[PDB]
Paper text:
TgDCX is a doublecortin-domain protein associated with the conoid fibers, a set of strongly curved non-tubular tubulin-polymers in Toxoplasma. TgDCX contains two tubulin-binding domains: a partial P25α and the DCX/doublecortin domain. Previously we reported that TgDCX is specifically localized to the conoid in Toxoplasma, and that without TgDCX, the conoid structure becomes short and disordered, invasion of host cells is severely compromised, and the parasite forms many fewer and much smaller plaques relative to wild-type Toxoplasma.
The sequence conservation among the TgDCX orthologues is mostly restricted to the predicted P25α and doublecortin domains. Both the full-length TgDCX and the TgDCX71–243 fragment are insoluble in non-denaturing buffer systems, but we were able to purify and crystallize a soluble fragment (AA148–243) that contains the DCX domain and determine its structure by X-ray crystallography. The fold of TgDCX148–243 is very similar to that of the N-terminal DCX domain of human doublecortin, which itself is quite similar (root mean square distance (rmsd) of ~ 2 Å) to the doublecortin C-terminal DCX domain [HsDCX-N and HsDCX-C,]. Residues responsible for the four tubulin contact regions between HsDCX-N and tubulin identified by structural docking are in most cases similar. Given the high level of homology among the TgDCX orthologues in the region of their DCX domains, we used the structure of TgDCX148–243 as a model for threading the corresponding regions in the TgDCX orthologues in Chromera velia (CvDCX1, CvDCX2, CvDCX3), Vitrella brassicaformis (VbDCX1, VbDCX2, VbDCX3), Plasmodium falciparum (PfDCX), and Trichoplax adhaerens (TaDCX). At the location reported in corresponding to tubulin contact region #3 in HsDCX-N (K53), which abuts a strongly electronegative patch on β-tubulin, orthologues that bind efficiently to microtubules have a positive charge (R152 in TgDCX, lysine in CvDCX1 and PfDCX), whereas most of the orthologues that do not bind have isoleucine. The comparison of orthologues also revealed a reversal of polarity at one position: D201 in TgDCX and D at the corresponding location in CvDCX1 and PfDCX, is replaced by K or R at the corresponding residue in CvDCX2, CvDCX3, VbDCX2, VbDCX3, and TaDCX. Both sidechains however are orientated away from the microtubule, indicating that they are not directly involved in tubulin binding. Indeed, mutations at these two residues in TgDCX (R152I_D201R) and in a non-binding orthologue CvDCX2 (I85R_R134D) do not appreciably decrease TgDCX binding to microtubules nor increase CvDCX2 binding in Xenopus S3 Cells. When expressed in Toxoplasma (whether in the wild-type or in the TgDCX knockout background), mCherryFP-TgDCX148–243 was not enriched in the conoid.
Author numbering: 148 to 239
Amino acid sequence: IPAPRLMWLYRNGDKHDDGTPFFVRPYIKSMESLYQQITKEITPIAGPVRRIFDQNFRVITDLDDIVDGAKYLCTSGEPPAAYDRLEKFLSE
């Protein structure tokens, strides 16, 4: 049983978002449960979170795929924002 993994959450389309740290507690078992807790934290101006992308724009489909310390782009069902809005999300 791992310790709670850390996600650096980025608000889709908010080019000034410097990232919001979020700890995935071990009880979270479904994606919708995770989306709900993430929505509470970052409150996207486009509605509750429905999609989370890693920095290679792969959609997260299961909790086991989350990487401690990785950065994630959260959308409300829209595609990722234009590239020039993604500089902070995409920086190493």
